[PDB]
Amino acid sequence: TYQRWQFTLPMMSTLYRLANQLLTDLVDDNYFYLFDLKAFFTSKALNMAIPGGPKFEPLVRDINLQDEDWNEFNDINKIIIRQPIRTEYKIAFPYLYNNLPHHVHLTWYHTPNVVFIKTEDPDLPAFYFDPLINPISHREPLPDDDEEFELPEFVEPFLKDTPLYTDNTANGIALLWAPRPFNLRSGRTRRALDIPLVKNWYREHCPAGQPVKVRV
Amino acid sequence: RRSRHCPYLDTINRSVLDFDFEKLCSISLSHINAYACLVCGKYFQGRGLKSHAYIHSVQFSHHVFLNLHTLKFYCLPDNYEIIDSSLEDITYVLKPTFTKQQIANLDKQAKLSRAYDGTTYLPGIVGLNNIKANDYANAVLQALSNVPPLRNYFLEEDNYKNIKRPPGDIMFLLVQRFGELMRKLWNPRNFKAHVSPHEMLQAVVLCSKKTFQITKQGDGVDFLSWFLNALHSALGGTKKKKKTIVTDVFQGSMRIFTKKLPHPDLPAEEKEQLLHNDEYQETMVESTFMYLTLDLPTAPLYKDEKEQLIIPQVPLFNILAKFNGITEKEYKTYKENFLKRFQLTKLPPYLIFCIKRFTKNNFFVEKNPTIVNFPITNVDLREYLSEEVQAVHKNTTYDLIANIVHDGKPSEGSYRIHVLHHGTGKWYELQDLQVTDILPQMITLSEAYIQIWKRR
Amino acid sequence: MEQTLPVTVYEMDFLADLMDNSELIRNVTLCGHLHHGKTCFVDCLIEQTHPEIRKRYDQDLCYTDILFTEQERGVGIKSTPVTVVLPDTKGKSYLFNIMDTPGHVNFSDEVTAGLRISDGVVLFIDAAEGVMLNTERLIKHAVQERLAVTVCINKIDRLILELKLPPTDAYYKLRHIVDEVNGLISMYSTDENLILSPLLGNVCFSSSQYSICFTLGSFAKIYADTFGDINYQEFAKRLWGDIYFNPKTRKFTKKAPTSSSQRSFVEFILEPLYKILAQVVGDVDTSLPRTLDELGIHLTKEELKLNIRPLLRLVCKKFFGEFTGFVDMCVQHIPSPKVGAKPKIEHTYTGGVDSDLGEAMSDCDPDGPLMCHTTKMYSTDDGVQFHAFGRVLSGTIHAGQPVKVLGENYTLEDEEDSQICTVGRLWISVARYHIEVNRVPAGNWVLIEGVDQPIVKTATITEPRGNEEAQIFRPLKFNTTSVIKIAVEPVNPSELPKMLDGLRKVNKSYPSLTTKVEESGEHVILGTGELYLDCVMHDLRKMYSEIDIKVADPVVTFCETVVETSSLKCFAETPNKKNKITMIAEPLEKGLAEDIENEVVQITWNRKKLGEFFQTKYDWDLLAARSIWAFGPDATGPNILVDDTLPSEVDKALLGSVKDSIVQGFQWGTREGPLCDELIRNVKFKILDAVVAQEPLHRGGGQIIPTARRVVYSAFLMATPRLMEPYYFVEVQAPADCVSAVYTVLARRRGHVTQDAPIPGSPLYTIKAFIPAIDSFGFETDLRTHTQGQAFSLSVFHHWQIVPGDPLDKSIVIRPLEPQPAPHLAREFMIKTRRRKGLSEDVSISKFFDDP
RNA sequence: ACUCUGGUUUCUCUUCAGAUCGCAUAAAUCUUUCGCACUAAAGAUUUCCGUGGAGAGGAACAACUCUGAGUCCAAUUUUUUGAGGCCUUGCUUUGGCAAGGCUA
């Protein structure tokens, strides 16, 4: 029936290597700040367009700002201006920078920065102090050495025989932070129709140097 | 020693003392220790050294304050109590529990009671401010006022304060404020000849879940029904008290004789054969009515050839014929027919008629212009009661005491009320803040919408 | 009581029995930096103590953070209390009251609410990020609140699965984190008794994602279980601190043998953990069963088919078992309510321990006078009623019991701010469910019902017809200052009351929130940041008042000051034309206002010590050091009132009669201020002369208080006035490349970068900056958008800095809608605020004088 | 350490399924909204693309991995003895019981 699949980690590592051209190698959703589904929903509900995002017809009828009759609340003689309140500010905090937040979805806040250091040299040990990591500047109620503490001969480190790393350890650690189809080791077969090969391509920001038609 | 001799008493002006609104500090929004400043009428918080009221006293030089909850006057910059009976009236305005005044009809007091300004008024006969479009609510509240038993019940705070409430229950806000409203209406000594219903209407809006708003006016009949039901439910403490003041005053017992009918598109033989089904016969669905819904006959369309006006005229006894007992008004729900015969079994002390004016036709809502010809001093309902029932009630002579009348188109309509002021015999028409002396004869001419009658 | 409750390992009767014994209770606050794993740790504890509750394979279940806004944002917003029964290492079950506080700096006030009703603090530090801004702030606040401190180094798996550090380098990173925490503690605490080190058991290493929680004692006990002959306490003593192990002699020595052997921690603790993690993530299908057998862990076929992250969680749950290391850490070092009652009373109770009732509360006896103290206000799901949450310090609270609730203004002389209320119900507050109980003894947390009406922020629950000398607990001193000011109005004024109600409710939900109404009828909300005000307005729009609300753009609350003395001695008489007061105003010395704010000096001290301090630290004259009257508007206010009236000219006894009135006027004037009705800061007021009427009735009261305010205003105005912007401190955790870009952002918002040091052991940098609060709106969004989300910043109030412009400059022309240049920003900030407050267009220097 | 169920693969039927039934995404109809509706939004219904859960039936080859169930400790601190004998007082169920002082 070809409905369920389970793979061993070396196979998934080879598959992830063979599909590196179709993956952006992002390890976070922080790349999608104010640019994800919830941010787009907030923009649409507020009838505002994110620069990199799409534009929609107004969700509700919008009254021209020239229609309000200069109340004490919106008196411009009282408003202090330092920076222009952008659309991004209003999307980030819909209930603070909007006077009528309706059908607005709160965008996910900051996630901790994944600091996964990608290994380039297979010959290097899996657990190795990469130069990317900032070197740590080195510099205790310890018991006295003369005391009679003895360790029984039955006692040794829990996995002393077990090697610290194996040839396919860095591959697994990389697979931890792979995109979703490769984060798994067991899964359910999908239709060829149901797999969008390029969905993550336009889900990300458009490249900086691009013509006007491809941006649209 | 500073008491009884505070020089800042002449600084008090009663012209600005409006106690008809929420009792919260104007600066901190805090209900706790709300003090009203008697010089400017603004509510502040606290009494100590660093409270908003103290700062206001030392800032605006207002040196007289009254505790909105303790009913005690203070001078804040020196912070000593004020004891003078001449200020007592102010407290009576703030807590005007008019138990005796509302004991009878709210308007029972027809005395030319003088307000602080030279505006003589009769207690109970007091106009209600029209906050946007709330004239229907003012008319209904005035109709429920001037009812001696209900008004007397709500004029005493102790009658309903001690009844239990659920923790997360908001319905009781309808009760207490309503009582508060009564004590404001029937106050013999008031600073102004009008009362703001703002707090009561806010409670109504909150309790009705955005129904019967203050900005958009609603039906008088629907609002009266909801208000009576909510008062009955809220006065039942943590349970359905079968006998509340609302039920004791307005609720009566009526016997519904529901007779199911065969489908008219059947042969006569099958029509009579269904008479033996024991389903299409009179049933015993006797229940309790809070008000009587009288259905006017349809407009005569073409005017009659007689010299009479195009406005139709129907006697009160003609609309009060569905409840005689033998009259069979057809009732037809979806794919079913009925014949609801009605027979009154217990006449409430105060009878409520809800005349049906606004009807939704195929395209819009039409207000029936039929004029009800009713007497205002003697109506005998003995002929609408069963013989075994007629013996129970010694009295059936009803006098009209309240008459809510709707004027204008169904959309942009206005509500006014004709109330009978007891003690005197005068009839007063109230529309918002307008109180006119109407002649007793002219009441029957207007399109009566809701009516309140007293059984004597 | 008897009610439906979820299935748990222990029994509710046992939980109620533990509450009676105050020696087995631990009041713990799990604080830390944003997203450092506190909520996930609480979820792990809940999963341990609740068999039916299991974390989803994909989504990290959060038992706390129950709010909808918390779920959507992913950021903890309100403190969640959780009462559990946790087994120790020896198996002794302890009652644990854990207040999971939010990690975001904007909600630091919330943590303060959780620090008043707790005896111990557990600070969660990311093993990768290390010590961040909120960790330092919370360390300072905790050690300043006289609380025991322990550390949980969470997310150690990031050292293994993200940084891929060598085990010795991971040990170095952990040691550096511990050393930095110890340095911070020693800097903020004079006493060196509370040294934190994992040898003492003060430090636990955890990974709440994979449920890897252990201390040295717990993991040594794991060794004892697998090899019986070893004693775990001595082994745990030998496990940490550059002590090497010799297997030839089986002995631990400070001298390293073979010059290549690793430390005890690396050999016995870190390396086995690395091997377990690497075997699970790298060699699962080929070599996981052998290592699982070696560890004694047996997994089913269906369990071995899980993905790598669930498999790690399962394996580490089976290996380490219960979080007994955390229980040890919080039992040995965090005082019980019995032990820790005395510091709490000495620090928070206003009457002090020396009072009879303070002595009564020092015992924390269940059978005493009731002295419950609630610091939180939790709204129900419907949002109508509020439950007051706090700990019971003495006596016992009973359901359906009359109670006297004392507000923040309750005093013995003025008892008006007290209300007799009937308690409705009592709940033991677990996160997602509440255990209704009949009574709660002293030393436990409780959700009192029916006492929410007379309290806004802080309450003092006591029993009526008794404790006639009972006083209130000190109101919550907050870590930061609420600055960001927003005006709020309804879309439809007809529904104004609802919003008002909502305001009250938010004032109860947020401990540091300040809602008021200005002179122009404008409703004002003060918050600590844009996220804080976003959450406040979401609550105000959806939970409390369901009406549409218009929100003005955010502005900051400025301060007022002087830079040089008054040109001439200002003066004012009473409306009686008597009681002339002549004053001058001068700026304070550098750091004096900081000393006053940070409680370094208190007016409650005697004359001798205060005069000695002001004479030695700031070299004041003895007469000047003894003539100080009051400190600013509030207690420990930044301003100072002194009288230089020589006794020859003015009778000191007569002046003392009006001393209270003059001090009240000074405090009110400093609270209001004449420029834009804002707090006067860092100004020294000297009373040069004071005529006083002899008769009592012509002085005091409403005569001298407004006169004092007028003369204070004149002295402030004649001295060159200036405005203080609030300057926030910003910490940016950004990649190495993005650091430069960060500067660019701070270039556009008047931001000054103070330091850009890297994070040791991490590939990121911490760029610290000082940005104006008025310019900070959208700075977080600007920085995250410009750097593609790789840079994240947290801003917290730091200080007050003078605005470059001169507020009293009528020559400056200001267009209605234009960002003004710096040289006259103050001129823009004074008039516009003056329009927001509702005052006149401009203020004149002789407005409050007597000549004109 | 020994016994006994629950097997896997595939085909078909029935039923439930608001579960991202689907880590994908279409069509139609009606209403509503402002333009003046492929180049447009909202609300609702329905049909297709095809799943999951449970049950039943069929036939293909596997029958106990797993899930389970049934099934080496005499020397301190507990289980290889400080263990037994004497006297007085209250009741004697005239066997002795209860307490204290002893000898060991």
UniProtKB/Swiss-Prot annotation, chain A:
<comment type="subunit">
    <text>Part of the U5 snRNP complex. Component of the U4/U6-U5 tri-snRNP complex composed of the U4, U6 and U5 snRNAs and at least PRPF3, PRPF4, PRPF6, PRPF8, PRPF31, SNRNP200, TXNL4A, SNRNP40, DDX23, CD2BP2, PPIH, SNU13, EFTUD2, SART1 and USP39. Component of the U5.U4atac/U6atac snRNP complexes in U12-dependent spliceosomes. Within the minor spliceosome, which acts on U12-type introns, interacts with PPIL2 and RBM48. Core component of U2-type precatalytic, catalytic and postcatalytic spliceosomal complexes. Found in a mRNA splicing-dependent exon junction complex (EJC) with SRRM1.</text>
</comment>
<protein>
    <recommendedName>
        <fullName>Pre-mRNA-processing-splicing factor 8</fullName>
    </recommendedName>
</protein>
<comment type="function">
    <text>Plays a role in pre-mRNA splicing as core component of precatalytic, catalytic and postcatalytic spliceosomal complexes, both of the predominant U2-type spliceosome and the minor U12-type spliceosome. Functions as a scaffold that mediates the ordered assembly of spliceosomal proteins and snRNAs. Required for the assembly of the U4/U6-U5 tri-snRNP complex, a building block of the spliceosome. Functions as a scaffold that positions spliceosomal U2, U5 and U6 snRNAs at splice sites on pre-mRNA substrates, so that splicing can occur. Interacts with both the 5' and the 3' splice site.</text>
</comment>
UniProtKB/Swiss-Prot annotation, chain B:
<dbReference type="GO" id="GO:0000398">
    <property type="term" value="P:mRNA splicing, via spliceosome"/>
</dbReference>
<dbReference type="GO" id="GO:0046540">
    <property type="term" value="C:U4/U6 x U5 tri-snRNP complex"/>
</dbReference>
<comment type="function">
    <text>Deubiquitinating enzyme that plays a role in many cellular processes including cellular antiviral response, epithelial morphogenesis, DNA repair or B-cell development. Plays a role in pre-mRNA splicing as a component of the U4/U6-U5 tri-snRNP, one of the building blocks of the precatalytic spliceosome. Specifically regulates immunoglobulin gene rearrangement in a spliceosome-dependent manner, which involves modulating chromatin interactions at the Igh locus and therefore plays an essential role in B-cell development.</text>
</comment>
<dbReference type="GO" id="GO:0016787">
    <property type="term" value="F:hydrolase activity"/>
</dbReference>
<comment type="subunit">
    <text>The U4/U6-U5 tri-snRNP complex is a building block of the precatalytic spliceosome (spliceosome B complex). Component of the U4/U6-U5 tri-snRNP complex composed of the U4, U6 and U5 snRNAs and at least PRPF3, PRPF4, PRPF6, PRPF8, PRPF31, SNRNP200, TXNL4A, SNRNP40, SNRPB, SNRPD1, SNRPD2, SNRPD3, SNRPE, SNRPF, SNRPG, DDX23, CD2BP2, PPIH, SNU13, EFTUD2, SART1 and USP39, plus LSM2, LSM3, LSM4, LSM5, LSM6, LSM7 and LSM8.</text>
</comment>
<feature type="binding site">
    <location>
        <position position="56"/>
    </location>
    <ligand>
        <name>Zn(2+)</name>
    </ligand>
</feature>
<feature type="binding site">
    <location>
        <position position="37"/>
    </location>
    <ligand>
        <name>Zn(2+)</name>
    </ligand>
</feature>
<keyword id="KW-0131">Cell cycle</keyword>
<keyword id="KW-0747">Spliceosome</keyword>
<keyword id="KW-0863">Zinc-finger</keyword>
<dbReference type="GO" id="GO:0005681">
    <property type="term" value="C:spliceosomal complex"/>
</dbReference>
<dbReference type="GO" id="GO:0000245">
    <property type="term" value="P:spliceosomal complex assembly"/>
</dbReference>
<keyword id="KW-0862">Zinc</keyword>
<keyword id="KW-0132">Cell division</keyword>
<keyword id="KW-0507">mRNA processing</keyword>
Swiss-Prot record, chain C:
<keyword id="KW-0832">Ubl conjugation</keyword>
<dbReference type="GO" id="GO:0042220">
    <property type="term" value="P:response to cocaine"/>
</dbReference>
<dbReference type="GO" id="GO:0000398">
    <property type="term" value="P:mRNA splicing, via spliceosome"/>
</dbReference>
<dbReference type="InterPro" id="IPR000640">
    <property type="entry name" value="EFG_V-like"/>
</dbReference>
<dbReference type="InterPro" id="IPR020568">
    <property type="entry name" value="Ribosomal_Su5_D2-typ_SF"/>
</dbReference>
<dbReference type="InterPro" id="IPR014721">
    <property type="entry name" value="Ribsml_uS5_D2-typ_fold_subgr"/>
</dbReference>
<dbReference type="GO" id="GO:0016607">
    <property type="term" value="C:nuclear speck"/>
</dbReference>
<dbReference type="GO" id="GO:0016020">
    <property type="term" value="C:membrane"/>
</dbReference>
<keyword id="KW-0547">Nucleotide-binding</keyword>
<keyword id="KW-0597">Phosphoprotein</keyword>
<dbReference type="GO" id="GO:0015030">
    <property type="term" value="C:Cajal body"/>
</dbReference>
<dbReference type="GO" id="GO:0043231">
    <property type="term" value="C:intracellular membrane-bounded organelle"/>
</dbReference>
<dbReference type="InterPro" id="IPR005225">
    <property type="entry name" value="Small_GTP-bd"/>
</dbReference>
<keyword id="KW-0507">mRNA processing</keyword>
<dbReference type="InterPro" id="IPR009000">
    <property type="entry name" value="Transl_B-barrel_sf"/>
</dbReference>
